[PDB]
Amino acid sequence: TKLLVSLKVLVIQLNPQIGQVDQTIKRTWSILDKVTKSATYVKPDIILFPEFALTGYSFHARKDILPYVTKKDEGPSFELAKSISEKFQCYTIIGYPEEDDEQKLYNSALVVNPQGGQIFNYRKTFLYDTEMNWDCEENPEGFQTFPMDFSKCAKLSNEDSYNRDVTLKASIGISMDLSPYKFMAPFNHFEFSSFCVDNNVELILCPMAWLNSTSITDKQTLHNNSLLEAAKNKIAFALKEQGLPLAGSQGIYQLKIGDSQRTPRVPSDDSTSEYKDMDEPDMSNVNYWILRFFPFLYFKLRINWFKNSSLIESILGKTRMPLDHEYYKKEDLLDSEEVIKDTVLEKTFLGTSLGQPWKFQGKNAILVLANRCGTEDGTTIFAGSSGIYKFNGKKSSLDSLNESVELLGNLGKGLEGAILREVQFEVFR
């Protein structure tokens, strides 16, 4: 049975700096105040914050992050999410540095329900270089899904109001989760978005601290002090030229609350990566994020792949996680008398399944991406450009020109702020 859903989604975009937790919390409440006073404010059903939203991102040592870590149900990030959830009767998701009872450290995202109860805690699964600085662990469960019970958000197709409840299958992916494993795995594995398609995920939530490519990431540059000093001067100039302090903008809020302004479809070029125009999204990254969700995108060639059975071996052969992942530290169908289970028929590679050219065809999914803005260490510029997307499953560019994705709205690359969109889509029950 087709069920129509309407979700009011609020994304908060922050520029947290290390050691400013109290200031960032104060700015967060300021943003939320301004949001409620907006001409077209409506109450959000879900509020999403970035990766390490209150603490800053670039920790260089375990000792440096220890003063900011918390248990998943204690401390500033949890208490903020609980108060938010209670005041707005919503789900609130926030990224934060976690410590467990055994003194292990993770990069996590906690989920609070409208009652102010913690219902889920997700840990980053693919780690970035920075996490290795401070002894961060990989999520031993790998990618995960969880239910979210939404009240009064759904209707049958012939009904005139959203008066029904719906439990959506959700998944959180934290920044690097979207990349090829360690940047070393084949690009076309699309591990995270494949997992979401495999498990029929409906609501994809991504707290991120994702870089604009103006950032200094070249390893030989980072470890040659002469080259590094020259590189840092380049970034300093880029910020100065924009009338910005080196850490980037804070406290000046771009609000897009309840409007329906969509983001224009644009291809990447040698200018779309430039850190200029702070109220406009980084379309190099928007296009790249969309590409990393390839399994959700319409692509003509899949009919040939299916007809030729070109991906059967890849589909049968793919494992739940990379074999060297923390996941297996958990345990050929064609050469066996074991039967083919349902789960195998749900598996995809490049968006293709054993039974359909395009498994996602005819389905809907919502992607909510909360990316931080600002800069750290004089080297690292975050891309901002938080946004909300709909994959509509409708029947082949690999970017925002592909009309099987809908760009429902983005914030700029450089300003703190918030975006609210009412998102309408369907699920099947």
Short mmCIF file of C-alpha atoms in Angstrom, two decimals, residues 10-16 24 28 31 47-57 77 80 84 92-97 107-110 124 172-175 205-210 368-374 382-387 411 415-418:
data_model
loop_
_atom_site.label_atom_id
_atom_site.label_comp_id
_atom_site.label_asym_id
_atom_site.label_seq_id
_atom_site.Cartn_x
_atom_site.Cartn_y
_atom_site.Cartn_z
CA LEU A 10 15.32 21.60 9.61
CA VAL A 11 19.11 21.57 9.06
CA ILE A 12 21.43 23.66 11.24
CA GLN A 13 24.76 24.75 9.77
CA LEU A 14 27.45 25.77 12.26
CA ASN A 15 31.11 26.90 12.39
CA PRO A 16 32.21 25.39 15.72
CA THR A 24 28.45 27.60 19.90
CA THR A 28 22.60 27.61 18.28
CA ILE A 31 19.62 30.53 15.34
CA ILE A 47 16.39 18.67 13.19
CA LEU A 48 19.89 17.70 12.00
CA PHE A 49 23.25 19.14 13.07
CA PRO A 50 26.73 18.61 11.55
CA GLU A 51 29.53 16.22 12.46
CA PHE A 52 31.12 17.28 15.79
CA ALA A 53 28.63 20.15 15.82
CA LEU A 54 29.53 21.83 19.12
CA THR A 55 33.19 20.90 19.54
CA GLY A 56 35.09 21.68 16.33
CA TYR A 57 36.71 19.01 14.19
CA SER A 77 25.66 17.76 23.00
CA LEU A 80 21.29 20.36 23.87
CA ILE A 84 15.74 21.03 21.51
CA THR A 92 17.10 15.86 16.99
CA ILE A 93 20.36 14.37 15.61
CA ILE A 94 23.77 15.83 16.53
CA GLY A 95 27.38 14.80 15.93
CA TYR A 96 29.66 14.68 18.93
CA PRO A 97 32.86 13.04 20.22
CA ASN A 107 33.00 9.98 16.16
CA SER A 108 29.27 9.69 16.74
CA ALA A 109 25.78 11.01 16.09
CA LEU A 110 23.12 10.65 18.77
CA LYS A 124 31.33 6.76 12.12
CA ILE A 172 22.96 7.91 9.43
CA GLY A 173 26.20 8.32 7.48
CA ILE A 174 28.90 10.60 8.87
CA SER A 175 30.98 12.42 6.15
CA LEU A 205 20.82 11.58 7.45
CA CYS A 206 24.36 12.87 7.03
CA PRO A 207 26.10 15.01 9.65
CA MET A 208 29.33 16.06 7.93
CA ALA A 209 32.56 18.01 8.27
CA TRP A 210 33.32 17.84 4.58
CA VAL A 368 19.42 15.36 4.51
CA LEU A 369 22.97 16.68 4.64
CA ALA A 370 24.16 18.87 7.49
CA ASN A 371 27.69 20.06 6.72
CA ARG A 372 29.62 22.49 8.90
CA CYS A 373 31.21 25.68 7.54
CA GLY A 374 34.30 27.70 8.50
CA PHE A 382 34.79 23.20 5.27
CA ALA A 383 32.38 23.34 2.36
CA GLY A 384 29.13 24.20 4.16
CA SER A 385 26.33 23.89 1.59
CA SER A 386 23.98 21.89 3.82
CA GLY A 387 21.00 20.74 1.83
CA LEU A 411 22.59 26.88 2.38
CA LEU A 415 27.70 31.14 6.54
CA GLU A 416 26.20 29.72 9.69
CA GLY A 417 22.43 29.36 9.45
CA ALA A 418 19.48 27.08 8.96
#
